[PDB]
Symmetry: C11
Subunit: 69 residues, 11 copies
Amino acid sequence: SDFVVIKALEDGVNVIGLTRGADTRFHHSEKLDKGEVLIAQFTEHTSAIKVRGKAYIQTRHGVIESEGK
Amino acid sequence: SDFVVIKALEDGVNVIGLTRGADTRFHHSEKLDKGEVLIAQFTEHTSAIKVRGKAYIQTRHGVIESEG
Amino acid sequence: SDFVVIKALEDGVNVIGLTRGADTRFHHSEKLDKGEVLIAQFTEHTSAIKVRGKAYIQTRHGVIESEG
Amino acid sequence: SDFVVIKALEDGVNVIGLTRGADTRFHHSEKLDKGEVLIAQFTEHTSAIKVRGKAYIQTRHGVIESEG
Amino acid sequence: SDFVVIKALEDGVNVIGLTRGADTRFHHSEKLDKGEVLIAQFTEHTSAIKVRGKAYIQTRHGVIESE
Amino acid sequence: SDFVVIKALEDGVNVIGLTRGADTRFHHSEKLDKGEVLIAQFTEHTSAIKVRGKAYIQTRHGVIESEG
Amino acid sequence: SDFVVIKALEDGVNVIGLTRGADTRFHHSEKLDKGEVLIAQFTEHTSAIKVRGKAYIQTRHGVIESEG
Amino acid sequence: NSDFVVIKALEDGVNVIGLTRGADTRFHHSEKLDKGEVLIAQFTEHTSAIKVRGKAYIQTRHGVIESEG
Amino acid sequence: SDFVVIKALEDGVNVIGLTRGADTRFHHSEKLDKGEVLIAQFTEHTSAIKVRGKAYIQTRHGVIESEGK
Amino acid sequence: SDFVVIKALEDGVNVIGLTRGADTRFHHSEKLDKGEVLIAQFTEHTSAIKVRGKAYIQTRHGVIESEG
Amino acid sequence: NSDFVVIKALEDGVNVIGLTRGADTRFHHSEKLDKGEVLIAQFTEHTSAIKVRGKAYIQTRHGVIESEG
Ligand SMILES: N[C@@H](Cc1c[nH]c2ccccc12)C(=O)O
Ligand SMILES: N[C@@H](Cc1c[nH]c2ccccc12)C(=O)O
Ligand SMILES: N[C@@H](Cc1c[nH]c2ccccc12)C(=O)O
Ligand SMILES: N[C@@H](Cc1c[nH]c2ccccc12)C(=O)O
Ligand SMILES: N[C@@H](Cc1c[nH]c2ccccc12)C(=O)O
Ligand SMILES: N[C@@H](Cc1c[nH]c2ccccc12)C(=O)O
Ligand SMILES: N[C@@H](Cc1c[nH]c2ccccc12)C(=O)O
Ligand SMILES: N[C@@H](Cc1c[nH]c2ccccc12)C(=O)O
Ligand SMILES: N[C@@H](Cc1c[nH]c2ccccc12)C(=O)O
Ligand SMILES: N[C@@H](Cc1c[nH]c2ccccc12)C(=O)O
Ligand SMILES: N[C@@H](Cc1c[nH]c2ccccc12)C(=O)O
């Protein structure tokens, strides 16, 4: 199963897993501070992942960068 | 199972799931504000995804950009 | 399964799913306005997809363009 | 399962499904007008496809063009 | 399952399917006129394909031409 | 299953299927006239294939030619 | 099944395994001294791994570096 | 779905020999090729090693090799 | 299943297997002296591997070096 | 399932199959004379293969030469 | 269908040591190689780690490495 790499570029970044199934809502928000890396899979319980905050992201499709409000 | 990366390029972008099955209708619309990134799989419930508003999109077939 | 990306280059583009099975007919027509993007799988219900209107399309086989 | 992309380069192009099985006959013919694209899988019911009329075709093996 | 692309370069091209199984015979011959393309899989009933007539052929192993 | 492409460069080329199993013998010979192409799989019944006569052969491991 | 390589660039790097399942919390923390390497899989019990502290990280998607 | 070897005889009397799969190893078949004939032969439920004797041009997934008589 | 290659660059390198499952602990420490090579899989019993000591390491993601103590 | 190509570069090259299983010993030695080629799989009975004598060897990891 | 390693002895008395798969880890076999011999050895039901002692040229799917005596 695929995974995404997320490196926080400032404090307070949130990687949010959205529930798998007919229902779509946030089940968990993992908070990352500046410099930390989260490597997160898609799973039975998480079928979409949202990133809020400034972060450097790698997936199988390449690099992308989230920008904070 | 594949996924698509969506980065919002302005406020109020909508990433819309369409139901898998005999029936095709919306089911969920995830609102992304500017700079937010959503990475979303195809799933038992979602077999098509629409993007509305200005966003940078990556799939296994390359980059594409939606326009609001 | 494989999926196709379709970006509407003008208003009222139709992405039409043809039923899987012994019978072949349209079960669903998804209208895209200019600039919208539809990322759509082949599925248990859909074994062929037809695009009507000006659009930019990506498949595993590369780029192709439908014209109005 | 594999698919073929067909872009009609003139009106009245026919994309014809041939039946899977001991029997071989045409079970469906999809008519494409100029600039329409059809992306069509091999399936339980369709194990060979025939294109008649001027079209641009992509498959896993590359590009080929049918002529009217 | 893999497929072959055949483009007829002249009228009257035959794409012939050969039976899978202990015995080998032709069970279908599809006629292609000039410019028509057939894309044909190997299947439960067809384990070999013969092309007669002038055509441009593509497979996973690249291009070949019948005459 | 893998397949082999054989193009006959002279009349009378033989493409010979050898039986799968503890016994090895020829079960079929398909005769090809100059310029005919045969695309033939390995199968439940055919675990080796022999070619006699002048032909251009393609397999997954590249081109080889047989000579009469 | 995928794995990540973590090389500690200073003492006390913390590799944190998050529980697979409807609930998310950490179930194990493996500390690495400077120059030590951990090569760790995604598993039935771990579906996300967080790195705290200065580390050089390799995954299938390339190199990334955590900073303390 | 198994791998296969291509053997082109470069002289008469080339032998492609199949060795039995299983606890017993022996030759179970020897296919004679004359000059310029080609044999494309799979590994099988009965054949888990293949010996070539005589001068032949051989292709496997590992590339070209040549046997010498 | 994946494996890692470890070549000891000094005496006394440890290649340590961590238990698969809900419990995580070391279950084995393989000592390598200089110049010895260990090629070790992930397994039903080992889902993470730690190297301590100076070693040259190859994985499917490429070369990494552990630095000694 | 993998295979090794062995080309004898002198007479009496010995290709030795080691038993799969909890015990390890040789169960077959196949001698090759100069210029003969053996293409041998790993199998239910052979999980390690030893070559003695001068031989040119291909495996999926490249070429290697034994020295006799 | 497992991975395999290629070991070529560069001196006499090289040892290719198979380690037991499973909860317990011990040497179950040491195959001794003399100079110039090549062993091609799979990972298996019984062997989940392989140790090489002595001077040898090694190939695996991650590249070449050399053990030293
Ligand atoms: N318990 C969660 C852990 C997780 C994996 N990937 C995530 C992405 C975002 C948030 C949480 C997660 C799960 O198995 O799904
Ligand atoms: N619960 C939804 C989550 C989701 C995944 N991909 C999406 C794309 C668009 C909207 C929602 C989704 C599902 O599993 O299908
Ligand atoms: N409910 C439809 C959704 C769909 C997927 N791909 C499409 C292409 C065209 C039209 C509809 C669709 C299905 O599961 O098949
Ligand atoms: N109902 C048809 C739809 C179809 C798929 N590919 C085609 C090619 C040609 C004609 C029809 C089709 C089927 O599932 O087979
Ligand atoms: N009914 C035939 C159709 C077919 C597929 N490929 C072919 C090649 C030649 C002739 C017929 C065919 C089958 O499923 O086998
Ligand atoms: N009926 C034969 C047809 C065949 C397939 N490949 C061949 C190669 C050579 C000769 C015959 C064949 C079979 O299924 O095996
Ligand atoms: N009847 C033999 C035919 C064969 C396949 N590959 C071979 C290689 C050599 C000799 C014979 C063969 C088998 O199925 O195994
Ligand atoms: N008996 C251990 C052997 C082993 C494999 N890889 C390892 C890595 C480190 C330590 C021990 C091992 C197991 O099967 O898991
Ligand atoms: N017992 C843990 C070991 C582990 C694997 N990968 C990890 C990553 C982080 C922390 C622990 C681990 C497991 O099998 O899941
Ligand atoms: N009967 C043996 C034949 C064999 C295959 N590969 C070998 C390598 C060496 C010696 C014998 C063999 C087997 O099936 O295992
Ligand atoms: N009987 C051993 C043979 C073996 C394979 N690879 C090895 C590596 C080292 C020592 C012995 C072996 C086994 O099946 O596991």
